Ligand binder design. Structure first.
Ligand code: A1AN1
Ligand code: AMP
Lengths: 1036, 554
């Protein structure tokens, strides 16, 4: 029975015991919180004196007689009892079968690892002795994490052996007074809390984007399965890292931490990465703290940030200084430091731990120092472990690493590769201290050669003839067939050839040719295809212009092109205000030119085709293809596409955009028939689909906005043509709606998705979908014949599969450069660094290799949103909006306030009016609150360029969060919330951590609840549903 | 420094470490630094490893090496001494004839007390302890203290032979009464000494102006006098213990401390006191507003030796009180019966020296450190004696730093800092409990003169305050233990209270003190109260919750 006499003391919990009490209260899938030192002793051991010495050890240390009381208190307490013996079970197995003994022992030992301590009701140690022979004993000694840092066991076992020796030799205890843990508590209360929180809020200040490592899978279940991998660096590489450290004025722990820093950088995009570092937390200010038994070990954020020009030595200095500046404050609990950060939680998700002295070895050396009758012959330890990953490092003779990781979340190949990269970094750093962080490669030869093989595979041999020579060699095959039809008028291939020969013979009289270029401001007509092919046969490059362009833009394009000659219809002659010769394509003299084939007089290597892009330059700039570039595409398109040959293709893309010519040459050189359609008819879907179905068009090509939106125009989408077999699309991150899903699934149309900068060609990768199954965000697929594709970092270094980087494109598709403003060209176009002799174009796109060998697109490098610590795929929010039955067409953009603070917003067009919440809930079904748009704008129409891309410029500026009503019903929790949080009135649907709560105040909350009412609710509830309404499931 | 080089050598293992080689370049870490510092402190040098790491070169860290113990300045010191709070109180109280406000004792030595020996001892005493040299100049009509050097005239000395008079006691009484009038505070010795010869042995009179001495300072002065006389009788060089931090530096550090925000953190407590003390009052038998010391009378009450031993040994344990807590709770009950007031305020003299400046050691420092603070005793709930003693126990523990702060705020903190503090509650009543007399009779080499006269250290001393000085406190209550008995002294002014009312008050005290000693000795258990446990702000409403939860859990 209890009596008040028995309590020695009470205390408030120290921050570490506060954190570990929270942790122990959180989990119940296991409560493995434990350590199980398992020590093998041979020789002679008086179990009676061992028992006595354990009882004297528990009497000596107040921390072993501590119990933690929290059930109803304002604040957790340590209560220390004056007397509290620990269990000492003893099992003499010396009379048991060697076959039984090891089994019985193992069964017990594994059962003990399951026997959870109750932090109040039970003593927080156990000991068990198994006597296995006349001279063989095995000890199991489980204890709770909350009692002490596991390494403290080296002290406790030393005291225990000293006591045992004193009892065996009947000699007075020599032990010094216990350095009482209350001495540290006093120092923690002496220290100024706010000065340290005001330092850690500064340390984390600019932390824009969270660190990651490539987690295999989402948390579909808590299938946690503790797993390990381990490796070590060679003798020489380790002492080389020691030489680097001792030359740079930093610890070896700093070199190891910087190597892991650079690794996390290269594995992310970032120049600024943060991970957990575990520090002893013992403030050197305390007298005798290196003998103080208790709980000190602390987790601090560790941040490595680099400038682009920074040498590794210059990162060493900076991370060293940042470590010294942190040392005064490393006692602050991470639960408060997290509250100082815009990442209010999940600031850290893996640890790097450095331990110069493991407990084994250190313990395994001890009893060798005393003459007692037994020798400790082996030792083991066990520690259930928190994080999904933890990199232990032991600076042994050979610098040894171990990745404790949850193999439910990291594939073994991921970790194996990660250790390969971690050794390759370490070797690069170790050879030159002064290499730039950009110039350190992660990849071993086995990965380098495997990635480069994707250029050498899918090489192909082609005749590489000129594009009009390919037409001529096709036209001789079936000249009598109808090649092109426009309105209700058509040309045969023969007539197209003859008219092109005539026009080319005429145009050569103007001096057009290899040294020359021709402007083709022609509106859509049969004359347009004849015009193009004739200018091609004239051997100069053709420069098309959309009549619908601004006249100022037309005149700019003409004058910047230095074009001498422009081909137009009569009415367009007023458009050419420039001092340039203007040719009527109808001029009857062309009828007098010799209609037989004109000779081929320019070669496949030469310039071919130029169009003007948008960009960051206020001037549009002209990108120019060589004939070899299109010829290379044609042979691939024939060899490796499911597009049928003798087929009817709808031309759609306007001549200002290269997919127009993907239509034209792919149709003609496949011998198909071009169905042209009048300019404005692109505006009349009710007429487009009528034409397509009534003309029974078999092949179409559609901009990405047409796929997103027009298939949600229910009246017309339910009337969509079904004669089509194949669709081509390019230009924007492709999205397939639930409607487009249902249509493709029913009609089994083959959809082809193509990608390319246009500066090579808008096809240089592709994928195609049989309509059997379709991802919501399809990949951009495989590279194509004689195209090399590389994901590089800013150093032009390859980077491993599954990692994002700059999508460099190489091979026969790479254009010559820019027609004018050629000074930009050397920035974008360069030789393939890994293989001179191929041109390469620096696309502004990020991409990632998928393990299956498809290529993933991640949008422009300029638009990596990284809202409030998190990256966001705007296509996911677009997918969710476009799959809402009420939404026909929608866009999402990173807007910003007039201070420059970025925010998400959505621009939406709907079949009905609905409230903001009637879509916001539809997002909250699936999207985290970092990636639901802050505002929704309703529009009549999304702005599109005639190329079909959405335009960020024409959408209106926004006008005018978690905020919630005080829909009170019972204030009881609100009063509890208000009294604990203090900072604000509390909304009934409001979020405890958004209100500024944190892990420990949650236990203060629940402990208040379970006294202010006869109520209880498991702590996980407040993390599953961090709201007052969450407890509606628990009030009754 | 060579020692630090030697530690680096025999900790980092590398030999021949240069004078400015780098700790991290030599392979140090968070552990080699600990090994250096632990090793280094064996030479009594201290160095926080924060400095060893941050200044990782021998030439740069040596600038942060310190001695583990400061050597307090044992030299001769002089000059301006700022008033301490109790000195400022004294000058602000502005007595008539301030040159006669003293403490004293009469020593006796059977075998004689030869003048030259005791003179040489007092000489060394005043050379050693500096504060006994001060003078108080009244410059510009303010006051400033000058600590004099050894410029001669350390103390006045007189010698007499009383054998010509049979009534030696009357002669020595009248002569010591004479000497008390002679403190030239502006210019002269503040220590007066007289030796009276008699056939039965020599008697030695010491008198010292109270501005420079204190009871602890008397214990020091006596045991130093004993060891000095032992040296003089042995003929060895008179050589007193190492001088602790001199009063000048205490005054300086106090003036510096008086403006720290640390002290101001106490300000809401003393405000919460004064804002409740506003209507505190004490009745008088006659309406009068000043008295002279000749009007004061005192009376004594005693407990028996058995009850005194019970109070000293057994009455504490039942509540973990200390002696002061019981005497003061009894004083509360006494006033609760006698005055029938709802509340009363009592002023207590702490010994000062409250470790306020960590580098300050005053264990051997002569001065007037007596620190005065008010306390409010609650009298509303006297019925459960089990709880009244608990309540009084806890209030005595809520006082910060045992009350040294309050008179700094009244006298030394710069008046913008000291907030709303009104300082206009005055010591109508004061209580103090001395130890045993053993500070006087501390040693056998000499003892208290049987002709002690009116010259005691305590407030029962007749001669040491000038008869014309104003009575600054109406009730002065002091306890002491002598003859194995507790003696309580009540001092009152005959013009403010009449004899019957103090006989009432003193019996209503003895009654409740014996009631408390019985009650707390009979209680055989032990109880404890929130101040025992080391939980900040724990309360009766909470400690008995925790002891309920443990009783339910186990
Ligand atoms: P110099 O730098 O050499 O150091 C000086 C010396 C003298 C060497 C001194 O340090 C020493 O004697 N050495 C001690 C041992 N070696 C060291 O140097 C330090 C060290 C300690 C421990 C290990 C090993 C660890 C790490 C310890 C544990 O780490 C861990 O995962 N933390 C405990 C889990 N508890 C938590 O909940 C985490 C902290 N709380 C939080 O903030 C949580 O995020 C909350 C609770 C959720 C916050 O709530 P809400 O607000 O979010 C256990 C992991 C692994 C062990 C093991 C098994 N090996 N060693 C190594 C070195
Ligand atoms: N099919 C596509 N999917 C994703 N992005 C594309 C696609 N086509 C072009 N782009 C991107 O749009 C830009 C080039 O546009 P354009 O040159 O007008 O085709 C580059 O950022 C390309 O990565």
């Amino acid at each position: 029975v209890f009596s008040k006499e028995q309590v020695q003391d009470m205390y408030a919990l120290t921050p570490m015991q506060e954190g570990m009490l929270f942790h122990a209260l959180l989990d119940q899938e296991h409560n493995s919180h434990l350590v199980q030192m398992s020590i093998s002793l041979q020789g002679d051991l008086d179990v009676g004196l061992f028992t006595d010495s354990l009882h004297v050890l528990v009497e000596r240390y107040d921390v072993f007689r501590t119990l933690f009381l929290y059930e109803k208190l304002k604040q957790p307490l340590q209560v220390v009892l004056k007397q509290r013996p620990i269990p000492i079970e003893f099992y003499d197995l010396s009379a048991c079968d060697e076959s039984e003994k090891q089994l019985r022992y193992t069964q017990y030992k594994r059962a003990d690892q399951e026997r959870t301590f109750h932090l109040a009701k039970d003593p927080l140690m156990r000991v068990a002795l198994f006597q296995m022979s006349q001279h063989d004993y095995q000890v199991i000694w489980s204890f709770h994490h909350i009692l002490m840092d596991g390494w403290c066991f080296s002290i406790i076992f030393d005291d225990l052996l000293a006591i045992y020796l004193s009892l065996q030799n009947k000699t007075a205890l020599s032990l010094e007074p216990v350095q009482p843990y209350s001495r540290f508590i006093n120092w923690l209360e002496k220290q100024n809390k706010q000065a340290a929180l005001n330092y850690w809020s500064d340390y984390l200040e600019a932390y824009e984007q969270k660190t990651t490592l490539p987690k295999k899978e989402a948390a579909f279940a808590k299938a946690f399965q503790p797993t390990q991998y381990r490796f070590s660096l060679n003798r020489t590489l380790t002492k080389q890292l020691g030489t680097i450290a001792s030359q740079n004025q930093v610890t070896l722990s700093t070199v190891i931490q910087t190597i892991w820093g650079v690794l996390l950088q290269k594995y992310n995009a970032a120049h600024d990465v943060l991970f957990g570092s575990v520090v002893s937390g013992r403030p050197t200010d305390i007298v005798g703290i290196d003998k103080m038994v208790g709980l000190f070990i602390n987790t601090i954020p560790f941040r490595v940030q680099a400038k682009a020009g920074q040498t590794f030595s210059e990162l060493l200095q900076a991370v060293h200084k940042r470590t010294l500046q942190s040392q005064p404050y490393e006692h602050v609990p991470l639960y408060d430091i997290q509250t100082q950060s815009v990442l209010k939680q999940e600031l850290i998700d893996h640890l790097l731990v450095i331990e110069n002295y493991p407990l084994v070895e250190a313990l395994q050396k001890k009893a060798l120092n005393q003459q007692i009758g037994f020798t400790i012959t082996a030792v083991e330890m066990f520690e259930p472990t928190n994080y999904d990953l933890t990199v232990m490092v032991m600076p042994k003779e050979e610098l040894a690493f171990r990745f404790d990781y949850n193999a439910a979340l990291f594939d073994e190949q991921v970790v194996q590769k990660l250790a390969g990269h971690l050794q390759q970094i370490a070797d690069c750093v170790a050879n030159n201290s002064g290499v730039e962080l950009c110039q350190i490669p992660l990849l071993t030869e086995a990965e380098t050669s495997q990635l480069l093989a994707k250029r050498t595979e899918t090489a192909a041999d082609y005749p590489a003839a000129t594009m009009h020579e390919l037409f001529s060699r096709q036209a001789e095959k079936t000249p009598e067939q109808v090649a092109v039809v426009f309105a209700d008028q058509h040309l045969t291939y023969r007539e197209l050839d003859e008219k092109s020969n005539q026009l080319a013979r005429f145009l050569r009289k103007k001096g057009i040719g290899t040294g020359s270029l021709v402007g083709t401001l022609l509106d859509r007509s049969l004359d347009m295809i004849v015009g193009i092919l004739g200018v091609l046969k004239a051997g100069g490059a053709f420069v098309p212009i959309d009549p619908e362009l601004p006249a100022e833009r037309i005149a700019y394009m003409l004058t910047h092109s230095r074009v001498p000659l422009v081909v137009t219809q009569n009415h367009l002659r007023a458009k050419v205000t420039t001092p340039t010769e203007t040719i009527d394509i109808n001029t009857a003299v062309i009828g007098e030119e010799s209609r037989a084939p004109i000779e081929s007089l320019n070669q496949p290597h030469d310039l071919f085709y130029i169009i003007y892009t948008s960009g960051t330059t206020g001037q549009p700039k002209g990108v120019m293809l060589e004939h070899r570039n299109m010829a290379n595409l044609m042979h691939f398109t024939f060899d490796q596409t499911n597009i049928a040959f003798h087929e009817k293709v709808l031309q759609y893309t306007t001549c200002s955009f290269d997919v127009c010519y993907q239509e034209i040459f792919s149709t003609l050189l496949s011998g198909g028939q071009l169905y042209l359609i009048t300019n404005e008819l692109r505006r009349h879907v009710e007429k487009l689909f009528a034409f397509i179905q009534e003309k029974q068009i078999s092949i179409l090509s559609l901009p990405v906005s047409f796929l997103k939106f027009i298939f949600n125009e229910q009246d017309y989408a339910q009337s969509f043509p079904r004669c089509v077999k194949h669709i081509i699309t390019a230009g924007e991150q492709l999205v397939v709606t639930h409607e487009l899903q249902k249509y493709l699934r029913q009609h089994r149309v083959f959809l082809h998705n193509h990608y390319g900068p246009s500066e090579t060609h808008v096809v240089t990768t592709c994928t195609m979908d049989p309509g059997q199954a379709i991802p919501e965000l399809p990949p951009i697929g495989k590279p194509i014949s004689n195209t090399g594709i590389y994901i590089l970092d800013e150093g032009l270094q390859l980077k491993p599969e599954g990692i994002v980087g700059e999508l460099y494109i190489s091979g026969a598709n790479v254009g010559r450069g820019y027609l004018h403003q050629p000074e930009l060209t050397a920035e974008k176009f360069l030789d393939n660094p890994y293989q001179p002799g191929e041109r390469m174009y620096r696309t502004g796109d990020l991409a990632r290799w998928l393990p299956d060998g498809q290529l993933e697109f991640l949008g422009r490098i300029d638009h990596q949103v990284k809202i409030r610590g998190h990256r966001i795929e705007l296509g996911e929010i677009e997918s969710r909006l476009l799959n809402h039955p009420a939404i026909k067409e929608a866009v999402v953009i990173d807007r910003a306030d007039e201070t420059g603070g970025k925010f998400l917003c959505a621009y939406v067009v709907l079949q009905k009016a609905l409230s903001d919440e009637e879509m916001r809930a539809y997002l909250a079904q699936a999207l985290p609150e970092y990636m639901i748009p802050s505002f929704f704008v309703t529009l009549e129409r999304i702005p599109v360029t005639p190329n079909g891309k959405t335009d960020r410029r024409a959408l209106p500026k926004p006008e005018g969060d978690y905020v919630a009503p005080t829909t009170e019903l019972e204030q009881k929790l609100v009063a509890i919330w208000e009294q604990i949080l203090g900072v604000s009135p509390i909304g009934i649907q409001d979020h405890f951590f958004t209100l500024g709560g944190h892990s420990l105040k949650a236990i203060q909350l629940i402990s208040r609840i379970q006294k202010e009412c006869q109520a209880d609710v498991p702590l996980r509830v407040l993390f599953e549903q961090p709201t007052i309404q969450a407890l509606a499931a628990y009030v009754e | 420094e060579s020692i630090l080089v030697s530690i680096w050598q025999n900790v980092l293992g590398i030999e021949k470490i240069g004078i400015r080689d780098n700790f991290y370049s030599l392979g140090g870490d968070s552990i080699q630094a600990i090994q250096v510092v632990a090793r280094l402190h064996s030479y009594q040098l201290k160095l926080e490893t924060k400095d060893l790491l941050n200044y990782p070169t021998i030439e740069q860290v040596a600038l942060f090496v310190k001695s583990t113990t400061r050597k307090s300045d044992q030299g001769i010191i002089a000059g301006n001494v700022p008033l301490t709070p109790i000195q400022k109180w004294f000058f602000g109280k502005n007595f008539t004839n301030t040159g006669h406000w003293n403490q004293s004792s009469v020593l006796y030595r059977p075998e004689g007390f030869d003048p030259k020996v005791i003179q040489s001892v007092m000489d060394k005493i005043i050379e050693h302890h500096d504060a006994l040299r001060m003078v108080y100049q009244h410059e510009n009509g303010n006051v400033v203290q000058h600590n004099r050097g050894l410029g001669g005239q350390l103390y006045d000395f007189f010698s007499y032979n009383l054998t010509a008079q049979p009534d030696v006691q009357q002669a020595i009484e009248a002569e010591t009464q004479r000497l008390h009038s002679s403190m030239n505070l502006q210019e002269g010795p503040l220590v007066k000494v007289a030796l009276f010869q008699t056939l039965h042995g020599d008697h030695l009179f010491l008198a010292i102006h109270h501005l420079v001495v204190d009871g602890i300072s008397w214990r020091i002065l006596f045991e130093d006098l004993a060891t000095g006389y032992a040296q003089a009788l042995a003929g060895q060089a008179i050589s007193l213990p190492e001088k602790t931090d001199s009063f000048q530096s205490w005054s300086q550090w106090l003036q510096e401390y008086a403006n720290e925000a640390d002290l101001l953190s106490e300000i809401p407590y003393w405000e919460s006191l004064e804002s409740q003390a506003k209507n505190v009052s004490l009745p008088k038998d006659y309406e009068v507003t000043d008295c002279k010391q000749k009007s004061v009378r005192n009376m004594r009450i005693r407990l028996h030796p058995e009850e005194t031993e019970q109070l000293l040994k057994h009455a504490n344990q039942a509540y973990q009180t200390e002696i002061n807590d019981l005497l003061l709770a009894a004083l509360g009950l006494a006033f609760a019966e006698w005055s029938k007031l709802a509340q009363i305020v009592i002023h207590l003299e702490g010994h000062g020296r409250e470790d306020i400046i960590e580098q300050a050691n005053v264990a051997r420092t002569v001065g007037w450190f007596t620190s005065q603070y008010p306390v409010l005793l609650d009298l509303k709930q006297t019925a459960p004696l089990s709880d009244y003693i608990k309540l009084t126990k806890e209030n005595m523990r809520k006082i910060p730093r045992k009350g040294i702060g309050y008179d700094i705020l009244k006298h030394v903190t710069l008046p913008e800092n000291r907030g709303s503090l009104s300082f206009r509650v005055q010591p109508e009543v004061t209580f103090n409990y001395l130890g045993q007399f053993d500070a006087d009779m501390r040693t056998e080499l000499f003892t208290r003169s049987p002709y002690s006269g009116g010259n005691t250290l305590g407030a029962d001393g007749k001669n040491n305050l000038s008869p014309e000085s104003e009575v600054y406190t109406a009730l002065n209550i002091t306890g002491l233990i002598e003859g194995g008995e507790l003696v309580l002294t009540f001092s009152y002014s005959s013009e403010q209270y009449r004899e019957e009312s103090i006989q009432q008050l003193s019996q209503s005290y003895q009654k409740h003190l014996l009631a408390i000693i019985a009650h707390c000795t009979e209680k055989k258990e032990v109880e404890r109260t929130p101040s025992d446990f080391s939980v900040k702000g724990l309360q009766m409403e909470e400690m008995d919750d925790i002891f309920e939860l443990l009783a339910n859990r186990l």
